[PDB]
From a paper:
Transmembrane protein 2 (TMEM2) is a cell surface protein that has been reported to degrade HA into ~5 kDa fragments and play an essential role in systemic HA turnover. Recently, two homologous proteins that are not members of the HYAL family have been implicated in extracellular HA degradation: CEMIP (cell migration-inducing and hyaluronan-binding protein, also called KIAA1199 or HYBID) and TMEM2 (transmembrane protein 2). The two proteins share the same domain structure (see below) but differ in one important respect: CEMIP is a secreted protein, whereas TMEM2 is a type II transmembrane protein in the plasma membrane 3 . Subsequent studies showed that TMEM2 is essential for systemic HA turnover 6 and that it regulates cell adhesion and migration via HA degradation at focal adhesion sites 7 .
We collected a high-redundancy X-ray diffraction data set (deposited in the PDB, see Underlying data) to 3.5 Å resolution and solved the structure by molecular replacement using the AlphaFold model of TMEM2 9 . Nearly the entire ectodomain (residues 112-1381) is resolved in the crystal structure, which matches the AlphaFold model with a root-mean-square (r.m.s.) deviation of only 1.1 Å (1270 Cα atoms). A small β-sandwich and a larger lectin-like domain (26% sequence identity to the N-terminal domain of protein O-linked-mannose β-1,2-N-acetylglucosaminyltransferase 1 (POMGNT1) 20 ) are inserted into the β-helix after three complete turns without disrupting its regular structure. The β-helix is followed by a large β-sandwich that is not closely related to any other known structure (termed domain X). The polypeptide chain then runs halfway down the β-helix before forming a second lectin-like domain (20% identity to POMGNT1) and, finally, a C terminal helix. The majority of active sites are located roughly in the middle of the β-helix, which in sTMEM2 is obstructed by two long loops, made up of residues 627-662 and 733-756. The three key sugar-binding residues of POMGNT1 are conserved in TMEM2, suggesting that lectin-like domain 1 may bind carbohydrates. We found that pure, crystallisable, soluble TMEM2 has no detectable hyaluronidase activity.
Residue numbers in the entry: 112 to 1381
């Protein structure tokens, strides 16, 4: 099975001749056995070059070549998919851009597969990437590294160290030189110390002058010091001991004072273990150097740092490198680590050499899986480009101060077999077009539709520190990419080029640190986009937001592609970008689309993660300018064009039915702008969680009529979070930090500190927000945070069909909805869209009114006297029927429309139009059905106007009164406007009447009344045909009315001086009010309690509530919540829950509560009463003195009998069994302070627990993997 175990292989050894060219032709079945340096290698005519492997994995081979050119049946094998390569091989691609000559199709520094070429590489199978099963605070410690040093801190400097957490509890300086009162506060300091607290001391300047014998006795007693009895003048001394630890828990030293020097330091150092197995050393010192008396401490991690992971990583080896991602807004918080030899590590742990500088989440935070991804980079098959210490030549050096010209791999069409697996690709790619670390160029169908038995696959590579892209797909369908890692590369990491690439499946792939590039406009950052005008027209200055700044980790230029189990852990702009090309571009720019892209239904999208990005997590909009730079459109070719309207239909056929695009199990957090932006017709986002984003989710469509007739936009079974317990880390270019909304803690923020954080944004529509839950949305005095809101600075449409249903709000959600105010982010808040903000509360889950509509407070076109003023939301709650009217005006530009309802004439609405850049500006206010309005202008009357009835049911109607000069003839026509072909069908004319009263009798007749006194052209707008679903227009078209005026009066057509109070009617109520219902519905919210990226493993949400003294007086109980079960208890004592770890849903086998009296009986029950393999949940309440259980916690998980002590409450989660999980934890506190509200997540049905495998765990992801294969 092995390719090197081929007997026909000759052993090869060419030498070190950088000018020796090599050609492997027919019969040349060579087996490389030693390091080599040749100019080139060309494998052709059936030649074979296999790397020689060993049964043990020791033969380190390093090839070095200007290039390798595989073609015409030639083969290059480094192991086989069945008999994999075991030693460490390396192919170094060298040669500068301007050194020697270059190839025609290829550049230099490459490995190039051609037609019929065989490139077969298969490295050592390792584990690609998993998640942190435990968090990792900076500097390796739970509460961080302490370093201190100061000159002339005279006296006895003291520090206390929590023996379980290595936290600095107290820091004090007792001037036992001058003041005898100080040697007295020092002795009383050591009397009230908890036993077992690590203590360190260091003489500052000169102690031993006012020091008392009662204190020197206390030091010898509490800490086991043998030398304190004889401290002297200007004598340095440092100690590190354990309170009540006897003499053997102590380590001390001393130095004399001679010739103004101590001849060296006086160091005291011991090692301890956190209760988490992490080792740390407490260090203290005091010395004299030529006169200075320094004194310092250092509490730091020692013997490497032990990391916790989700899955088994036994395949990782010392001397290999890994990477831990950012769990904060700045992607530059990802870090590199080198694996230490660890004999004491389990299957879910390794040891890293370095000290972490940042914070990396390893827990599920408030139901959102914020665990940091962790991936291995070192392989045994390496293909690397040779680079320089700094930039050179015209390799884009004004932007990069380093070499950006490495190697690249390139595979042409009609090849034989490409199968790359477990290969390391360092310093690959060039800043030249087509030169990418793995470049599949125009290969066509490469699966069962192209003729490949083994579909061409890329399995678990490692492409890091590359100079352009990571893997590029150039006009290739059906490719597979699996378990691959792309780190610190330029331009879009994973790249779908021309927008024709379909059937490609991306499974469980990871991408970090996607930095700006210089290739495409979309790849450039703000500085590069304003510089490279070499491809723009004339003196045009490119705009860096509308044409560039589109750096994405996953660039999907076509939707028919399957994205599963991936994770975009950081990017300069976006994490996953789905976009659409109007017609094929690039080198594929030519063949006609037989299925235009923005009509093709989305492939699979299931269980993805996106975080650490500045512009978006998942983005679905925009296109590429499919035209070169010209005089009518000077934008660069392939820049960003916001004129793409997704609208998926069957077979990409707009005459055929709609096909919804499913966004499933998206997890997205710590994004600076949007968590997800999705536009078009028929999109359903479900089972998704959004957290710590500036805006959680936004649904778009079009600004006038929807991009696809009948466009529903659903979000169901989702979860939103505002400011979770992921306080982030103020570092790694984290540009924003502020005050939390709830706890008012220092945390990192997405944008400026006054940005109103938002959960869901309403825009365009029609949008169905259902069965979703919002948590932790509190505003600060700076910003107006809210759960549900609207898009800022909106001027377009908003429909009253946007309904929010079955939504649940958390206890820390103070502002359910908000409509904006004049401020820094809303500006006027006075544009055409801001004024017409509205949604529909179907069931009464948002406002407490079954079937009620909500809009902005000062919008008087929707108000009847039964409404409820709401000032906090800046809104108003009412009920009725509502639609919209679109008013197009010609002949007059920059015109501002003023429309008023008769019933509230003192409250008109001045609109400013929609096309203040085009020639046909329309105005789109929202109205209440079966009412009368009037319209007036800030200028002369338009000679032609169209009235569209949008969202009208049959027989729904309003009366309208247009202001015209007293001197006008009219000609009014109705018709059905067919959206498809611009034709007007079934046209009817209007006939005048004598009075407003005669037209009222003829309400369903095509009649109009003109009041020459006021100038009002009255008529009735009534719909004849029916609607269907959510389409804005009727069955037989978009009903519209056309009014052709004939006048020469240039006067401001504003009749309100004359129209009222002549046509005033007393305000009435068509649809009356219900009553409130503060008390949530049964069913409100999302069914799922926790959203993880391993949906197959069931996670048990557990939540505690241990009040304090002011709350125990006020009566608040102590509660242990399990999946939503409040096991309440208020007696002073202990509540112990025994949960079966194999039951899903959980089966709690025993609940027990121990009073303060029978506290002594918990010793016994813990020793025996706990069934084997049983999850222990335990929380106390009140002053519990002497809990002789400090030692009884270790078999359940702990490392050493930690010290709760005193009378403080405690909370513990453990396991009675052989295994010792990573989630086991403990929370101690002083009495009366309590523990507040914490939240843990316990996985269930793990084979570590000792549970049987009832059935095979239904991995829904892998089912989508085998379905999309064939
Ligand atoms: C329908 O009725 C309106 C209203 O006319 C009313 O009744 C008469 C009796 C007068 O009292 C008016 O003041 C009332 O408002 C008519 O509008 C006015 O029409 C008259 C006659 O056409 C206009 O008087 C002229 O105005 C000229 C100014 O406009 C000219 O100059 C500009 C300058 O650029 C030029 O661009 C434009 O094309 C015009 O040619 C003025 O030069 C001239 O000497 C004469 O006085 C009066 O100005 C009109 N009002 C306004 C606001 O313009 C309508 O004309 C009438 N319909 C039709 C079809 O005629
Ligand atoms: C804007 O300018 C860019 C250049 O900066 C320009 O891109 C060029 O487009 C042409 C499109 O024809 C590309 O030419 C192709 O070259 C490949 C091989 O290199 C050929 O195989 C292609 O022909 C195939 O397609 C035909 C149609 O089916 C078949 O009949 C034929 O037999 C072949 O199968 C094609 O000739 C050219 O490579 C690019 N160049 C670059 C640098 O991208 C772009 O077209 C300009 N914009 C517009 C709108 O034209
Ligand atoms: C633009 O596209 C629109 C949508 O395709 C066109 O809309 C029109 O919509 C009406 C609906 O009110 C269609 O009415 C159809 O009526 C036929 C009945 O005719 C049948 O019988 C006669 C024999 O008497 C036969 O000659 C016909 O071919 C039919 O077989 C029904 O079968 C339909 O279900 C439907 O009710 C119109 O047909 C339809 N127009 C067309 C051209 O189909 C709009 O007309 C288009 N405008 C332009 C300018 O092309
Ligand atoms: C914690 O509490 C949660 C409360 O929501 C639990 O989550 C849900 O628990 C219910 C328990 O009834 C599960 O319902 C199961 O559904 C599966 C699958 O059938 C589904 O599909 C069919 C149609 O094919 C439909 O008719 C069913 O109603 C289901 O919707 C069945 O095999 C079971 O018999 C049972 O009906 C939910 O599926 C589950 N929600 C999920 C998994 O998202 C949770 O289990 C509790 N325990 C934990 C988290 O450990
Ligand atoms: C490790 O993670 C923890 C948890 O987020 C971080 O702990 C926080 O550290 C800050 C230090 O600036 C504490 O602020 C101060 O705490 C003292 C002691 O109670 C208090 O008297 C001050 O008023 C101030 O609040 C903060 O309390 C603490 N978190 C909590 C919940 O108390 C820590 O910063 C992370 N990193 C390291 C290196 O420890
Ligand atoms: C790749 O090679 C195949 C095989 O030669 C080409 O497929 C065609 O296969 C049919 C089978 O009946 C032959 O009759 C044709 O002569 C083959 N060639 C052509 C041009 O049709 C295929 O065209 C090749 N593709 C490329 C891009 O070279
Ligand atoms: C938003 O509300 C509209 C109107 O209330 C809903 O449209 C109704 O849908 C039902 C189907 O369940 C139809 O039977 C009714 O005829 C529709 N019109 C009504 C009640 O006036 C719509 O389903 C809601 N959701 C969306 C996304 O539009
Ligand atoms: C309700 O709010 C509007 C908005 O300004 C205000 O004009 C009106 O007086 C208020 N009425 C009541 C009864 O609060
Ligand atoms: C429990 O521990 C305390 C230590 O504070 C000790 O005094 C007491 O005697 C212990 N309990 C029993 C029953 O000995
Ligand atoms: Cl209970
Ligand atoms: Ni290519």
């Amino acid at each position: 099975n092995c390719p090197d175990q081929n007997p026909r292989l000759r052993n090869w050894d060419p030498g070190q001749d950088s000018a020796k060219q090599v050609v492997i032709k027919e019969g040349d079945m060579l087996r490389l056995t030693s390091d080599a340096t040749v100019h080139s290698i060309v494998i052709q005519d059936g030649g074979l070059l296999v790397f020689g492997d060993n049964k043990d994995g020791s033969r380190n081979i390093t090839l070095r070549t200007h290039y390798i050119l595989i073609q015409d049946g030639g083969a290059l094998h480094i192991g086989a998919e069945k008999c994999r390569y075991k030693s460490k091989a390396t192919i170094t691609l060298y040669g500068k851009s301007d050194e020697g000559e270059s190839m025609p199709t290829f550049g230099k520094k490459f490995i190039g597969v051609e037609a019929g070429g065989t490139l077969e590489l298969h490295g050592a199978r390792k584990a690609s990437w998993t998640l942190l099963a435990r968090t990792l605070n900076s500097s390796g410690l739970p509460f961080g590294s302490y370093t201190f040093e100061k000159d002339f801190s005279r006296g006895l400097n003291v520090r206390v160290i929590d023996q379980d957490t290595a936290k600095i509890l107290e820091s004090e300086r007792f001037d036992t030189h001058e003041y005898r009162n100080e040697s007295r506060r020092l002795q009383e300091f050591l009397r009230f110390q908890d036993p077992g607290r690590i203590v360190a001391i260091a003489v500052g300047d000169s102690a031993a002058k006012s020091l008392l014998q009662g204190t020197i006795q206390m030091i010898q007693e509490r800490l086991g010091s043998e030398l304190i009895q004889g401290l002297g003048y200007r004598q340095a001394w440092a100690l590190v001991g354990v309170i009540d630890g006897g003499s053997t828990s102590c380590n001390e030293s001393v130095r004399n004072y001679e010739n103004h020097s101590s001849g060296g330091k006086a160091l005291a150092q011991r090692e301890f273990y956190t209760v988490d197995g992490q080792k740390f050393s407490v260090t203290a010192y005091s010395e004299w150097i030529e006169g200075v008396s320094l004194s310092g401490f250092r509490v730091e991690v020692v013997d490497g740092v032990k990391l916790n992971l989700l899955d088994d990583v036994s395949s990782w080896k010392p001397g290999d490198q890994i990477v831990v991602a950012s769990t904060d807004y700045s992607m530059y918080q990802a870090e590199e680590f080198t694996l230490l030899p660890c004999s004491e590590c389990s299957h879910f742990q390794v040891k890293v050499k370095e000290t972490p500088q940042f914070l990396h989440m390893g827990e599920i935070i408030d139901g959102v899986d914020m665990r940091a991804e962790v991936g291995i980079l070192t392989r045994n098959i390496v293909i690397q480009g040779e680079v320089e210490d700094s930039c050179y030549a015209e390799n884009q050096c004004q932007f990069f101060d380093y070499d950006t010209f490495g190697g690249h791999i390139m595979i042409m069409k009609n090849f034989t077999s490409v199968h790359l697996s477990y290969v390391e690709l360092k310093h690959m790619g060039q800043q030249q077009m087509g030169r990418y670390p793995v470049h599949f160029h125009l290969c066509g169908d490469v699966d069962y539709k192209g003729g490949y038995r083994h579909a061409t696959f890329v399995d678990g590579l490692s492409i890091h520190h590359s100079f352009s892209r990571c893997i590029t797909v150039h006009g290739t369908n059906g490719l597979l990419i699996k378990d691959t890692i792309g780190f610190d590369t330029l331009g879009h990491c994973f790249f779908l080029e021309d927008g024709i690439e379909q059937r490609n499946t991306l499974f469980h792939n990871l991408g970090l640190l996607t930095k700006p590039g210089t290739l495409l406009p979309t790849d450039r950052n703000n500085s590069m986009c304003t510089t490279m005008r070499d491809k723009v027209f004339g003196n045009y200055i490119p705009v860096p937001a509308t044409d560039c700044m589109a750096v994405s980790t996953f660039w999907i230029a076509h939707p028919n592609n399957n994205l599963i189990n991936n994770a975009a852990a950081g990017s300069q702009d976006a994490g996953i970008w789905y976009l659409f090309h109007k017609e094929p571009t690039g080198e594929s720019s030519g063949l006609q689309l037989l299925a235009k892209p923005e009509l093709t239904p989305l492939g699979i999208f299931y269980n993805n993660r996106v975080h650490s990005n500045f512009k978006a997590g998942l983005f679905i909009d925009k296109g590429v300018k499919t035209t070169n730079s010209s005089a009518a459109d000077p934008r660069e070719y392939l820049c960003l064009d916001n004129s793409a309207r997704f609208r998926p239909h069957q077979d990409a056929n707009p005459e055929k039915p709609r096909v919804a695009a499913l966004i499933d199990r998206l997890i997205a957090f710590k994004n600076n702008d949007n968590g997800a932006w999705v536009r078009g017709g028929d999109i359903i986002v479900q089972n998704s969680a959004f957290a710590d984003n500036g805006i959680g989710l936004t649904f778009a469509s079009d600004g006038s009529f929807p991009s696809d007739e009948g466009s529903s936009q659903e979000v169901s079974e989702s979860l939103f979070v505002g400011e979770s317990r992921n306080y982030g880390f103020q570092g790694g270019q984290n540009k924003y930090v502020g005050t939390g909304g709830i706890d008012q803690k220092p945390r990192t923020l997405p944008r400026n500190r006054t940005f109103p954080i938002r959960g869901f944004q309403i825009y365009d529509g029609p949008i169905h927000l259902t069965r979703s839950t919002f948590k932790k949305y509190v505003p600060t005095p700076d910003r107006y945070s809210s759960a549900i809101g609207f898009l800022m600075k909106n001027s377009w449409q908003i429909t009253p069909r946007n309904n929010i249903s079955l939504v649940k709000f958390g206890p820390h959600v103070s502002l359910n909805v908000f409509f904006g105010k004049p401020g820094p982010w809303f500006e006027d808040c006075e544009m055409d869209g801001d004024k017409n903000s509205i949604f529909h509360d179907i069931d009464g889950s948002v406002t407490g009114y079954k079937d009620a509509y909500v809009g902005r407070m000062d919008n008087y076109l929707i108000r009847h006297p039964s409404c409820v003023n709401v000032s906090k939301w800046n809104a108003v709650i009412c009920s009725g029927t509502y639609a919209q009217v679109y008013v197009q005006t010609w002949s007059t530009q920059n015109l501002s429309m003023t429309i008023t309802r008769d019933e509230y004439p003192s409250n008109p609405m001045v609109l400013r139009g929609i096309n203040q850049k085009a020639a046909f500006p329309q105005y789109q206010p929202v109205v209440m059905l079966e009412k009368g309005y009037t319209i007036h202008w800030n200028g002369p009357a338009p000679r032609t106007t169209f009235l569209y009835l949008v969202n009208f049911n049959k027989n729904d109607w309003i009366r309208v009164g247009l202001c015209y000069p007293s001197n006008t003839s009219f000609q009014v026509t109705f018709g059905y406007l067919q959206r498809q072909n611009g034709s007007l069908s079934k046209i009817e004319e209007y006939e005048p009447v004598h009075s407003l009263e005669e037209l009222q009798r003829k309400q369903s007749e095509r009649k109009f009344y003109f009041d020459s006194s006021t100038g009002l052209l009255f008529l009735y707008l009534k719909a004849k045909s029916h609607r269907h679903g959510h389409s804005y227009c009727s069955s037989q078209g978009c009903e519209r009315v056309k009014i052709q005026a004939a006048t020469d009066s240039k006067d401001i057509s504003n009749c309100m001086a004359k129209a009222y109070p002549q046509y005033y009617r007393k305000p009435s109520v068509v649809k009356r009010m219900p009553a409130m219902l503060t008390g949530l519905c049964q069913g409100c919210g999302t069914r799922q309690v926790v959203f993880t990226s391993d949906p197959h493993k069931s996670y048990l949400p557990v939540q505690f509530q241990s009040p304090d003294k002011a709350e125990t007086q006020r009566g608040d109980p102590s509660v242990i919540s399990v999946n939503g079960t409040d096991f309440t208890f208020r007696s002073a004592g202990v509540l112990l829950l025994v949960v079966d770890p194999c039951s899903v849903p959980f089966r709690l086998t025993e609940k027990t509560v121990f009073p303060l009296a029978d506290v002594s009986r918990i010793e016994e029950y813990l020793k025996t009463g706990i069934p084997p393999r049983s999850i222990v949940l335990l929380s106390t309440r009140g002053e519990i003195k002497q809990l002789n259980i400090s030692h009884l916690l270790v078999p359940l998980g702990l490392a050493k009998p930690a010290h709760l002590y005193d009378k403080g409450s405690t909370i513990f989660l453990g396991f009675s069994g052989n295994f010792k999980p990573s989630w086991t934890k403990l929370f101690t506190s002083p009495a009366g302070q309590g523990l507040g509200v914490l939240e843990q997540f316990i996985p269930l049905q793990l084979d570590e627990y000792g549970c049987p495998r009832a059935t095979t765990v239904r991995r829904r992801d892998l089912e989508l993997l085998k379905q999309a294969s064939k």
